[PDB]
Symmetry: C2
Subunit: 152 residues, 2 copies
Amino acid sequence: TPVEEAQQKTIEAITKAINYMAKRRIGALLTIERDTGMGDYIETGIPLNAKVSSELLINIFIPNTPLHDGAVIMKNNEIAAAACYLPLSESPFISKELGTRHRAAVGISEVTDSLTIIVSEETGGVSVAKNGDLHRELTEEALKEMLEAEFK
Amino acid sequence: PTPVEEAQQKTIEAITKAINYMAKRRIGALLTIERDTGMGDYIETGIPLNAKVSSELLINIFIPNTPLHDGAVIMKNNEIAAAACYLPLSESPFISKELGTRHRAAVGISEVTDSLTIIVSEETGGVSVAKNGDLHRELTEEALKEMLEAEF
Ligand SMILES: [Mg+2]
């Protein structure tokens, strides 16, 4: 359908951006709203309401730029805002090997049904936070499967 | 002030803040503001954004060595329509020999539209404007802001 094709385009854009950032070890934090509304978190960031593209996602997260710290939040197949605040998890089961981006991703995942992707600035490793759990060191195939499961 | 007027003032302030940031850092930039002549044909050559204006987004677009930094940003009323757009190159004999492709592209679009284009030189950080085939160079921050206010 037109909307199934739009979803696949968004998945491709996300995975291309994530792959680029993983290769360069560019830290990134990208939350995808699901059924739990995240307007309160969107409002803490810089409003964009932009078309998704791999290029825009990459440009947002470039180190030492205005938009690179904080989360991108996507809603209805658009980038709602960048540089957003997310609540830090207080879970005692998050390794101290991991950074603030990962604790923020886990945190938002504890209070929403959203899917958050994280790229580590230390290793380029890619992880996903969902339902309070953090899935580490994801392959490209695994990330794609998660996104397809989430967008279905 | 009506909401439209306030929105316009916020857009002007966003533009001037971004231009000043890039000028100080010698970040080359090429920003065309649509006026009464429609620029859809040029917008369609770039990466669609259809995004809300912010100084932060304008800056992030033009960071050197990133996907979006080459080509023109085209704005519509209070929107960043697209980035990395093509513009026609002017053949004017009055374009200084010291100037690069960004300036020639700015003059070029200004010869076939009533748009206003702002250029930041990557060599000097100097700021210029192209309108109606004329290039005005080495603008102070006050001169640029007044030009934008006169343009709306
Ligand atoms: Mg370059």
